[PDB]
Structure formats: C-alpha cells, structure tokens
Amino acid sequence: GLSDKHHGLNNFWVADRINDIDVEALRILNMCYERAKEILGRNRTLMDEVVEKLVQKKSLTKQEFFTLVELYGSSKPMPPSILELRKIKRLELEEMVLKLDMTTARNSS
C-alpha cells in the first residue's frame, strides 16, 4: 500500500494490473540501484581510506570511522523532517487565507 501507482491498491481483478504490479517493483529496484551507484561513486576517496583501514585493523569503532567520514565525506543534504514541512505549510496556509481575507475585504469595503 505504500506505492503511489493508482493509490496504493495492491489488489486487482484483471490480469493486466496484476502483471503491472510486479513491474513497479523492478522499477523501484532499478531506481534504488542507480541511487546507490551515484552515492557510491560520490565517495570513492572515503571508500579507499576506510577499506585500507579495514584490511589493516580488521575492526573499526564509531569514533575513528566517523573521523574518516568527516575527513573524506561529500555533501549529504538531509531532507527536511515532518516539523519543518508542517511549519512552512502552516505559514503558507496562513498567508494565503489572509490573502483571501483582504481579497474579500477590500473588494467588499
């Protein structure tokens, strides 16, 4: 039900839609594989440093691994969480409803 093809709807009757259900899984798999490939190609230097440390030490803790991530990482823009989206949508809703308020008031007054 997390798919957005029609609206969730993981059940159908005719053969065409049941056949098309499995195609979306392949499309999501390919999109995720391409995203993983792009992310992996972005961090080849961090790749090399951490793999050398892994063959040299056979075990890595949080501190040193995150230190190497900080030294050799790229930009990782975190998507906004629920709270920021709620706040921007709330301010947008308030501003458009007050826009409706003047477009009613000065048109009426």
Add this chain to the structure above:
Amino acid sequence: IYMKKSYLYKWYFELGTSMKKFTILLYLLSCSAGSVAQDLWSLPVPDEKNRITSYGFVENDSDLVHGLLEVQGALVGTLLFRSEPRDPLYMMQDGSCSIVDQRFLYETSQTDPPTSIYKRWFIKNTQEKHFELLIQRQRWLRTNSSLSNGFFRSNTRSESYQYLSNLFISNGTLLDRMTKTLLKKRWLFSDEMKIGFM
C-alpha cells in the same frame, strides 16, 4: 408412475475395452431422447412454465452425455465430418501427465528491530496469503479463457436432438399409445413394450 429410491457411467466404460466409435453415438442418442419427448409432447407457449428442473435422471443423462462427448473428443487423435479444434497446449499436458504417472508407478512487520543492516525488516512469511491469492486469480483467469471446445459439443447435441425430434415426429402415435398404457397400467415391462410397438 411410482417413484424409486446412479453409477452407470463406470460399468459401461470398464466393460468396454475395444468398443466401436459408432456405439458412442448410439449411447448419446439413447441418453438424450427423453428430453426430446418431453419437449415435444408438452404444449407450447408458456414462458417455460411447465419444466421439471432438478430431479433424478436428467442430471445423470447430462453427465453421461458430457462424459461420452469428452471420451469421443479426447480419442480423435468417414465417421465424423470434422474434428475438435485441438487447443495447441493439450499434447504438452498429456506428455507431462504421462511422465509423472510413469514416475509414480516406477517406484506484522518484525517488531523486533535489527541491530545489523544485514537482517531484514519484514518476515519472509508475512505476505504469503496475498501472493497465493494473486497466483490463484491469475491461474483462474488463464484457465477460464481458452475453452475453444465448448461450441462443437453443443452443435453435436443439437444435431442429435434434431434427428431425435424428426424421428419421434413420425412415430408420435407410438409414444402416445405407450404413455397412455403407462398411464392406465402402473407398470410397464419389455413384453408390454414390444406389444405396444405395433
């Protein structure tokens, strides 16, 4: 005229080892003439008001006719003007069935969180009912879409009914005096049968 208180299909088939292909036609003709007589001798034009649906031997006659038609159409591979359409997947099924018969005779979201990313997020046997339902629906759609052998048997029975009607029209007096004899005398044996054939 008195009611009675079932498995004639198997006796004829086991008693027949090397029977003719023409006696199947006679068996089909004899198993479908009572409906012809009932449709004939009942007066026409009600809205089917006087039909006798769902009683004893009509279902048995229909089952016997269907079985004889299946036997005749599965054994085709002159007598018959045409043959069955022969759906082009029947030979694979027969070959696989023979192979298997010979082989037989020759003997909920994982509420415990993962501490490692190697572990999965949902259990493998969580969504098995939905997969089975989709598979069964797809199999039903595939199986109930390729019956090209449902119109040959209908026309075969149609010609059988037409011939039976054309034959019973000429001998209408025979069935008339015969059903009257069954009406007065409550039992009817073969001797009275042959006497009333006059």
Add this chain to the structure above:
Amino acid sequence: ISETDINSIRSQPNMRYSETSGRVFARKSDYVNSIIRACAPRVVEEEMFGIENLCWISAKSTLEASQRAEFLILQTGMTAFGKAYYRNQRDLVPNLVPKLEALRDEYMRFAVEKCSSILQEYQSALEEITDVLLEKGEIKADEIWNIYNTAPRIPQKPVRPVDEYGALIYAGRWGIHGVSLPGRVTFSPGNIGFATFGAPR
C-alpha cells in the same frame, strides 16, 4: 462524534461515536459517504507531508475504501453493475471482472478527489484542531463544532461526479472494438456470407 485523543497508537483512529440503535434503513448516499470517509488518513498525509512521508498504518486506508466500494458494487445492487447479489468466492463470471474493476476504479477516484477537495477547503479548521490536540491531548465534540463553524473557508473547484456507465462503456467482452465497430462480410465458415458489426455469426 463524542471525543478525540492522540495518546494511543492504533491501526484505526482513536475516535469515539455515540451509538444509536435503529439502523433499519441506509441509502446509497450513506455507502458513498462511507467510501469517502474510509480513505481519510492517506490524503491528509499526502497533502501536508507528501507521498514520501506516508506511514505503514496510514497507507492501509484506501484498501478499506476499495473493499467498501466492492461491497457497494457487488452486494447492494443499487449501482449499474446489475440487480443481483454475488458472494465473492466463485459465482463471478469472467465477463463481470472488467466491469467490477472499472467501477471500483471510478468509485475510488471519486472518493480520493472528493477527499482532497474537502481537506483542502477546511485546512484552517484542520490546523486549529491539530494545534488544540497538540496542546491539550484531548478534544471534545463541542470545541470541534465551534472550530468548524468559526474557521474561514477556502473556495474550491467542483469535483467530477461519479458515473457508472461512463466507466462501463469500455468494459465489455470484445473490449474496445465494439464501441468502435468496423463491420465485415465473411464467406469462409459455411456457405452464407454475413455482414457483422460486433454481433456474432
């Protein structure tokens, strides 16, 4: 409505209603309204938070709406599907399957569009109720009704009404050729040539 709380986690909302026995009658509009109200949690999260923030328990809402649409189509006889009563398991002939699929798709499209149009209009009352529930953790029917009656309203475009025959026009045995019938003259099977437009020979 009686009360509303946000303190417990459940698959269904924590709403409470005042039961009144005596449901002798229920018209088709009640079924349509039930189908509409069934698919509420998905639309609000797709509107405010988008499709990439749907929860697992908030995405299993349109399934219930589709099941109620199936119940309305198959076991009420008030739609254009016919006036028969079908128990789902085996007395569903393959001819009726595309009709059922098209009718359910049309009903679910109407329900989703109506939900979006309703939830976009009353967004001010929606956020006021959300803020009150966040501050207090418990709201009652009187405050909900006061917020509903005092909040401003946003004009919205009219929705496309649900029609059953307009989804059943392209649901047939032949499919799409038969709404567009070319017609042909045949002489091959038998001895008689026939000019046919969709009708069997």
Add this chain to the structure above:
Amino acid sequence: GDENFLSSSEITKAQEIATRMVLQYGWGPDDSPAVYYATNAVSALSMGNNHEYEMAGKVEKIYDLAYEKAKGMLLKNRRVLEKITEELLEFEILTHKDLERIVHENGGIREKEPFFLSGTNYNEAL
C-alpha cells in the same frame, strides 16, 4: 465407420515420447541443448507463459514429422499389408520366415540407413 480404440495406447505413447525427446534429452527440431526436465524432477522449469506455445509447436512439429514418415513408408507397401492381413486371417499363426517371404515376393520396399525423422539437420560421425 469401423474405427479403432486399440491403437490409442500407442498414440499416447508417441505423444509421451515426443515431449520427452523435446524437453528432456534436448533432441529438439532445432537441436537445442536446453533441458527443462530431469529423471528425478517432480516438475519442469519456469518456461514462462509465452514460451510454452513454442515448445508445443515443436512437439506438434516432430509428431507430425513422425506421422508423415510412417505414412510415407507404409503407403508404399499396401499390397504387402493386405497380403499379411489375409494370410494371418486364414492361418492364425505366423512366423518370421513367411513374413520375409511376403516382403520379398510382394515387392516390399524396405528403408535404408541413416534413419532420421528430419534430414535437414543430420550430420555424420568422424
């Protein structure tokens, strides 16, 4: 009007042989080494949905080739077959020597090696 139910068991055996030597042994009409079934298997491979029709077409092709070959080699000795029927009917006991006599005097045209069901793909050993 005189049809036979006696030869049905040979027809079913022929249908079984065709599907065996198309699927199991890889002796298809195009000599494909693909194998879809094994001696210990309980079922076949996936075989898709649009690929079973190709396998059925190959099995029908080899079955028709076998029937055509048998018909061709049996319509050339019709008088031989009639004489064998008459002699079996009048004597009720037949040896190999009288059958050799029949296929000799009646002009019985025997076949010759190599025996292939389709000579379009036959090769020879080294």
Add this chain to the structure above:
Amino acid sequence: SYKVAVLGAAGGIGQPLSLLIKMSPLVSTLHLYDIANVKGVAADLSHCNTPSQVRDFTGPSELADCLKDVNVVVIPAGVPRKPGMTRDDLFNINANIVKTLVEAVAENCPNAFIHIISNPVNSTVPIAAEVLKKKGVYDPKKLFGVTTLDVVRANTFVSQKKNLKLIDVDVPVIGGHAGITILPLLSKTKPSVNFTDEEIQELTVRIQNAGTEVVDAKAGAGSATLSMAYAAARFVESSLRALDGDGDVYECSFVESTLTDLPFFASRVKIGKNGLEAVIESDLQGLTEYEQKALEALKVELKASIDKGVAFANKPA
C-alpha cells in the same frame, strides 16, 4: 428473429442499406416499402441464399400492411437535392414525406425502434416527435437520429492522421449533424493520443466539412450513398443487439436528451430492451476550452434548427 421495415428502400440510400440488412445475422424479415420501383429490389434480394425474408409493398394503401408487427422502422426516404432548388422546397418535400411516414408508423406500430435518416435530422426528429405527440402515443425512449456517419468519419480521419489501429479508434461526437453543429470530442479519443492545436483545428474542420467535400466531389451527382448506408446498417444492428438483452450496447445517437437546455441533442447513449436506457452525461464533463466555445457557438444554430422543425411540425392543415 427481429423484423425491420425500410420506408423508402428504392432510392439511392435504400438499396445498399436493404442489401446490408439482408446480410445481417439478426434480421429475419425485411419489409421494403417505396411508392415505386420497390419490387425490383425485392427480386434482387430474394435470390441470395440468406435466411432472412424480403417482402415489398407499393403505394400508401399497402403501408398499413407494411408496418404490422414491425420491430424496427427505418426511414431513409427523401428525394436528394436537385439543381436549382433551395433549402425551402426540399425541406418541405422531405418533411412532408417523413410526416406521412411517421403518421403511418404511429397509426400502425408505435412500439417500433424508429431510425430517422432523412436529412436534415436536426429538423426532422422534432417533426417526428411532434407527430407522435399528436396521437398521444409518443415514446421518447424509442426515437433515434442516426448520426453514426460523423463518428465513422472522425474515426477514419483520426486513424489516417495519427496512424493508429482503425479497429480500436473511437471518437465521441456531440452536437448536431449539419455544419458547425458537429463537435468531435477529440480529447477523449480511445486509445489515448494527444494532438496539437493546428491538428485539432484541421481535424475539426475536416469532420465538419466532410459532407460538403463528399457532395462537391461528386460534382452535383447527389449526396453520399454507401457511407450512410454503412452507418445505418451499423446502427440497426446495434439496436437489434440491444433488443436481445446485451448489456454493453453503447451508441452515439441524436435523441431527446436533458444534458443541455436543448430538447434534442446528439450524445452517447446506452440502449436496452425497452429502448433508451441511459444517457451518458460524462461526455459533457471535462471538456477543454476549444470544445466549450465550439459547443456554445453551435448551440444557437442547433436551437434555431430545432425551432424551425417544431414550427413546421405544428403548421395548420
């Protein structure tokens, strides 16, 4: 096992329509009627080895014998246009002929599927409705205007333009059957294909002027003959299919509809056992702006044509 009676089966359109009805596996009796030269068509048809029977009637006095127990009445009667004759006299002649025929049908068989082909159908169907109303037996559910020709032309033009399968392409057409009163709903064409602006304009003008193209290509030889016979045979066979209980018979026709303010309109309808069963209103929902202004432009002329029709249909005798 259904009966079709054609009134005017000895004209230009009548003979091919009668021949195609003879080939239909649904018709069992065909009643040709015309004031003259109707026995030759019956003699031509009777030699074909089709199970349907053809009988002919000559003169109005046999018209009462023409319409007994007739299940589908087809009216293609009407003299085609002659040189030097304006719209008024041809309109009067065709309207008088169709008025007499509808009077005969109302007296003999009110409960027959009435298919009007005589041109113009925008000002003829109201005349038939008014005549049927005067006898107190009018049934709006069993009176159709055969406008399948526009649908066939639209499908052919779309298939020739965008190169689709001609078997699958269907184009809904609303409005009328004359001039700019024809509105092809090209945005709802199945299968779904998106057009450009100039392509939409070209297809619209080609569909609207196909009639003048086909009557000027003949160089004054008359109107089209085979195409309306094709469309009338298609509509008759569709009506006969709907009469057998088939539950998916949807056809485009000009009937008394309540979709717009107009009393009569051409739209997609669903035909049942008892005549008209449903009128599809979703054909008027979701229209683009171009189709909207085309509809509002064609509404005035459609109203004028219907007004002229009902004005003639109530003239004193």
Add this chain to the structure above:
Amino acid sequence: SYKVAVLGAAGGIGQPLSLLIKMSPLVSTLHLYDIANVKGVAADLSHCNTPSQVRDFTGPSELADCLKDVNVVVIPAGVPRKPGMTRDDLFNINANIVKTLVEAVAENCPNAFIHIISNPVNSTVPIAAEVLKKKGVYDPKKLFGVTTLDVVRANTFVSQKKNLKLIDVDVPVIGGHAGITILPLLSKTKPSVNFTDEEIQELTVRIQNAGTEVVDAKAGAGSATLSMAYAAARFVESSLRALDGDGDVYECSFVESTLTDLPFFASRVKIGKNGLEAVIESDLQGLTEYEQKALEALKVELKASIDKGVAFANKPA
C-alpha cells in the same frame, strides 16, 4: 495483404461490389476504375472505418497506373440493357469494352486472378482467353467465369422447397450461365434429400429462368444487381483465400476445362495459390437420365456460344 482492381466500379454492379470488397477482411488496397463518376465512389468509400485503402483512376490513360502490382483483377464493366437494343449492339459494345480491358490487363499485369463478370459470360471468357493468347501471356489457370449466382439461386430454391438448414445447403450447377445451359445437379445436393419428378422439373426451370424472372420483375429497370454483387463478392473472397494458401477452396466456376469436348465449361474446381489447381470431374459421373439429356441438350448451344465468342475475338481490326 492483397489488392483487388475493379474495372467498371461506377456502374450498377460497381458500387455494391466495391462496398462489399472494401469491408472484407482480406483486401488491403482497392483500385477502382471507371471512365467517369469514379471519384464520388472513392470519396464515399474512403470515409468508412476499414483499413483497406481505396484509390481511383479516371480515363484509359490512368489504366497503366490502375493495374500495377494487382493480385486480383475483376471486370464487371458493361452497359445494361437499353430499350430498342438488340443483342448485336449490346454484345458488340460489351465485347469491345472487355477486349480493351483485357488488352490493358495483359499489357500491365497478367499474373492476376481475372474474374469475368460481364454478360454473357459464355461468350466473354473465350474472348478474354483469345485476347490474352494474342500477347503470348495467356494463363488458363488464372481466368475464371463468375457463375456462382446460379449456385446461390439453386441453394435458395432448394432450401425454400425442402425446408433444410441453409448453412448446409449447396447445389452443384454445371453447363453455362444463360438459360438452359444451367444444369443444377439436384441429385448431389448436400445434405442428402430426395426430390420428386415434378419437384425436380420445377426447380430446374426455376433455376434456369430466375435470370429472366429478375430481369422482367424490374419492368425494364435492369438485371440482377444485389445478388450478382453478392456472388461476385463471394467469388472474390474465395479467390483471395486461395491466394493465401487455403487448402479447401472448392468453388463453382466457368473455366477452360477438359471434362467435355467443349474448351470452356462451368464445373466445380479447386483453386490454389497459382490459380486453378484441380478440376472436379466427378460432377459429370453418376448423373441421372434427366440431367444427362439436359447436358446433351445444352452442349450444342454452349458450343455455339463459345464459337460465337472466338469468332468475334478474332475479327480483323
């Protein structure tokens, strides 16, 4: 995927036959031709929603463009009867037209199934054969005479008489296509039914004089049009099926046969990919004394007709 070229597609026969050929599922290109009034027929047919394409040509100068790559050539051209016309003038006009058309076919495309329809076909098929012989390209296996209307009429009359299943009724007809030449093999009618002597005589004379009955039923309005178009479309579809490799195409036709002493005869034949494949001789074996004496009665006049045809076809220019 086959092309049919109709020579004379704007006459009485030309339009219904073209309409039937257009919406048959075998033709994909239809090259109509007539000396005049062929543009309107093409415009009428081009509006139908059938995938087969129609093109038209005007005048003999476009004849070289009409017959290119054509698989089946059908020649129904010929002026119908006018009052005051004897057999001499009509025969001369029709034979000159068919001579010019067969000359054009031989020059442009001689590998096409040639279907001769013009009347009388007893004296026209020899003319076409002689014209094809003069160019050194004559193929007797690809020249047919469409005489299946006699078979259709025989089936119709037998079914009307004996009340038999019309989907099963077929009657062999031998001889020719004009009058007493028609010998319906009523004793070989399938399925098996037995006739009386009076019934046999009545059916024979009805089948032989059905042409005159349908001509004089029109009261001088022409010959059979719809049933002839029916027979022509049936033979066209059968020949197109023979071109597709169908192995059970048995049709009754008037071809150059060796069954009798006559060079040309009408019998049952089996048509293949390369034209004529077999001629069924068993139609002449097992005849009763009535059919035998009718055959020997019609043989002399059929010989006279063929001799007249080949005598005209070798007239000096």
Add this chain to the structure above:
Amino acid sequence: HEAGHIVLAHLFPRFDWHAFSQLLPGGKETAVSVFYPREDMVDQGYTTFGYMKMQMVVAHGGRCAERVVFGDNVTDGGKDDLEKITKIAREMVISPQSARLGLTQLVKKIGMGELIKYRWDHPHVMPAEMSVEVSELFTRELTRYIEETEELAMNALRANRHILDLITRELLEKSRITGLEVEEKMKDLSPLMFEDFVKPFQINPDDEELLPHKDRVSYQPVDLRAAPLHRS
C-alpha cells in the same frame, strides 16, 4: 415492507400457507412472516419453473412495495430477498431443461432438507471452464428473469394500493396478524388476480385421442463467436 410481502403472497392462486406475520419480533428491528409449503409439493420431490418464479416474485414484493410507497430512494431493508432471487434465478439457468443454455456444459461434478435444493452450492460441484461469450449469456438469463419478475411484482403492487395501505395500517396498529385476517381482508376488496404458474401438465388417462406436439425441440445450440477481424 411486510405488507408488500403479504399482499404479493396472497395475490397468487396457489401459494404457501401464511401462518402468521409479526412486526418487531423480540425487540429486533425487523419482522418475520411464516409460510408453510403445501403437502403436494413436499410429496412431489421436484420443483417447477412456475414455483420458483412464484417465490421470487414474492421475494421482490417487499422491496417493490417499499419503493412504490416511499419513492425511488430505496433502502437496504430487503437485501436478503435480493440474494434469494439471484440464487433462484440461477436454478432456472443451471438446469439442463433451459431453452437457451440447456445443450451446453454448465457447472461440473468433481466426483462424488429444503423444497428447492441449489445445485450450484453442492460441495462436489465446481464452476465449469467457460468462455467470455457464453458467461455473458448466463448473466443475460439471470438479468432477464430477475427483471421479468420485478416488473411482474411492480405491476401487481401498483395494481392494488388501497389493500396495501390497509394491510400497512393493520401491521402498524396490531403489530401482528395471521393468514386468516389477511384472507378476510382480501375478500370484499376485489384485487387483480394472477394466473396460475404451478398448474401441472397432465394427460387424459383413458381418452383415446392423439395429443399434438408443435413440431420441434425448443433447444437452441449455443454458438456465438465474432467474425475474424480486418487486415489478415
């Protein structure tokens, strides 16, 4: 609803005996009517087409009367009846004596009370393998029978409305009646009587005469397939 059921039950020449009808039985928001089948039908051992048409018209009755009285905004009070009719209609199509679907292999046996026994619901009866064309004919038979008996019930209920209002008043006042009260209330009002559907077809035993036949079997072969499409 129950007044319509009672009116259509007592509008037939030979129906089941109406023992009593009671409004609101034991506090439940419903009603119950009791009909006892006649002894001859129980002693027969088989059912006719007229009898199942009889019962399915009666089952249409309550909803049809509710729609006639309260308008076209019909409720879901009669859903069970809308089920029963369907099953009943199926029993007229599954039977081999059907004029249109008789000579065609319907639901098959996998290999192995009440006055009307449903062959569709047997544990050893599975649905047959059917094409897309003949199953629509099955649905067409179903819809045709259902609409025929619905039209019959509607005509019956719109025929006598005064009796319907009287009986509605009787249940509204007394909340329970018997068959005798309705029968004496059917007596002096002159309703529009139906024809007899369960009249038996019988033969004169000793009357020497040749009873006629039409001249045919009424069965038609099921053969419906479209013509091959274009461009081939």
